[model samples]
Target: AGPEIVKLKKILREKAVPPGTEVPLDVMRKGMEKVAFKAADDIQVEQVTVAGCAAEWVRAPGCQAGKAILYLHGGGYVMGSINTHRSMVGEISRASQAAALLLDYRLAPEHPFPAAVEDGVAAYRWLLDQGFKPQHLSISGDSAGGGLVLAVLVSARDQGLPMPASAIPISPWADMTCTNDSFKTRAEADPMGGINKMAARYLNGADAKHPYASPNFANLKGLPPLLIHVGRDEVLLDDSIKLDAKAKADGVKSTLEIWDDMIHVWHAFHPMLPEGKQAIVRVGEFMREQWAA
Candidate 1:
């Protein structure tokens, strides 16, 4: 814990994205892409498309020869893009000494329900096609993307695709119902916006408990090892907590880490915020360990 962590938490709390407000999808998309973060200079970034979806690859030294990660960016599902998250993804790749593929998956209202899920699967399959073995690859994401990470793994398992060695879902929005206690307990403290309206926005008409939409309700068996991170102050805190517990109860290897006084996706503010960098380093360490094993 450092003083910067406390300062960052305050900044996030004061600047929370407005809750339950309706914004045009186009506006939301463009605005999200414009939000900035400091990117590492040592990493190399290249734009590409996965199947039909736009994507980018962030690579660090020793990233070649099969070490790779497929990362999903967070935005509740109606927002977020490769541009919004590229720099943070670059830092993660640099820390882990692997290349990261950040997907610009189709968003909802226009491309609702299974479209994002399908794109996630397609991206993973695309990686497989490029000669990356399942064991040498890992899947990860934050917020809604984190939930999608689990959804993709479940979809892969049902379809008989090889599983990745590990997964990291940071401050994951695993429960779509927004019924978790954190929604109430940490509601005032969380920097991220509320869940109900945001959930409905992406879900459109999909079932709230649909396994593909709300992975916390999905069967946890047969998924690969998982490392779930969440801030104690996030309204979705219990989502990670319960997901970790359910995964273990269902015989999957899982670890749940609750950070003190952090905000949603705090790792996004690395370098300036010490805890942010610390969290990314922890993630890199976890990935390297899995790769070694």
Candidate 2:
């Protein structure tokens, strides 16, 4: 574990709600809203609608025309917004030499299950409608949004939609059932908490294991190639691992990268964590590789 990661653990632990305590959803959202991450001035951002959902186009200087990424932000299906993820998406856009459409997919408790999935697919569908080549596009997200990335791809597959060139899921919250062993072992070590409760709120009576609801158990056949990243120290580590195997077994090529001693969604800590910036760089590299093929 690096010193920066070590420092993050302490700060996040303080922010983490201890298990067995009820941290209101409002508190969580408000907290997420306050941790501001600013996008660079060089890139251009424009608000647009995907069907009925809100989205933004993030484009960096020198990006290739027609190359794009449909990016969803992570917030356990209940939190996260373009405001928090725009800078990171811009980072990837700059690296991949592509534009990124950051979606503000509807959240849960009010929107719940299928809502985010629906919005994600809609955005993708609209992108294809825009005449961008499938090979020039990709899908990605982090944590719950990471899980959403996979879910969107699976749903897109079942709907007979054209496949994007690749996917990058960052520490996806794949198992809504939260049965993985890392949930127990890394629970204390990771700063993220209330996994069990958040799952319930999002499901809102839907099956926890529904293919589109929690793609950890989804049929991965025919989906695009995936590059899944997770923090070795985060509770969601095994979600990526098991998902990679399942994706492979189902014939979807998948790559899993576990960063040593990192915490959940550490890429957001790029301001201080060197690994964070490096991870985003790799994401760009992955996008370039997929497009090259």
Candidate 3:
């Protein structure tokens, strides 16, 4: 519906491989590196320490005036790195009025399940070590990273660390079993993802019951308020939808926004689109509201 969303569709149609086909890890990495370089020109950023993880602090014009955000990038646990999600991070920095710390967490097909989870937990710990206030700190991500935001919360609880104030999971792939009917229903609708055999590749030998990979099946109670955004057209939309419903059922503070006819993580390309900008602005508002409370 939005011009930006339309252009993004066009770009993906003209650029991507066939649906359901998994991209090699190297190819995805190289492509993201290029995109990150291009996006960095638009945002203020600084390198930050997140233990062993490759991390960077992205700032919007006046973001430092508000809270701080820990950002996890989505690459299906095998391919994506911090570079792949730079544009989205830049827009998040600009909109949230809070600096975003993007982590280059390890991949799955290579590093396996617990490895990525461990790195994510370590990144959050690093945030606390830096003296960031608990209520003003938050976690955010899309797809796998989106799922990780919640996963990290569970990890924090299990490890006896304080959880961040809130979170935003944009079209999160919360269910690794991928049994949600949306994967089939929205198969043709999603453009940039769903075709990647990335999930199957990563879960080959890993435990599907692990909350780190699939937060939907994990304990949903006692988590922070969440503002979840999902595109109607994505295969992973069901994960967001179900997780929102579960959060409500469990009485966790949460809300869900379903954007019709959009692809997976479609709002990341704000430079080329209006829907993307709107999504970022909405998330920024969510952050502000939760931060004020």
Task: Give the top-scoring candidate (TM-score).
Answer: 2
Candidate 3, residue 62: the lDDT equals 73
TM-scores for every candidate against the unseen true structure: 0.94, 0.96, 0.92
lDDT for 59 in candidate 3 is: 78
Model 3, span 1-293: residue lDDT tens: 56666777787888877755766667776876766535756587777667677788887677665478888888777767666776788888777789888888888677777777788789888878878887888889888888888888888878888877889988887887777888788877777644236666666667776777788978877888999999888878889888998889877988898888678876776666677778989888888788888
Q: What lDDT, from 0 to 1, does candidate 2 have?
A: 0.88
**Native-referenced Cα lDDT, model 1:** 0.85
* Model 1 clashing residue pairs (backbone): none
Best by lDDT: 2
lDDT of each: 0.85, 0.88, 0.79
Compared with the true structure, what per-residue lDDT tens digits does model 2 show for residues 1-293? Answer: 48888787788777766667877889878887888688889989999988797889999887998799999898888888888898888888988999999999998889988899999999999999999889889998998998999899889888999889999999898889988998878766776647777788899988899988789899988888899989888888889999998998999988899988888888888878999999998999998899999
TM-score of 2: 0.96
List residue ranges in candidate 1 displaced over 4 A: 17-24
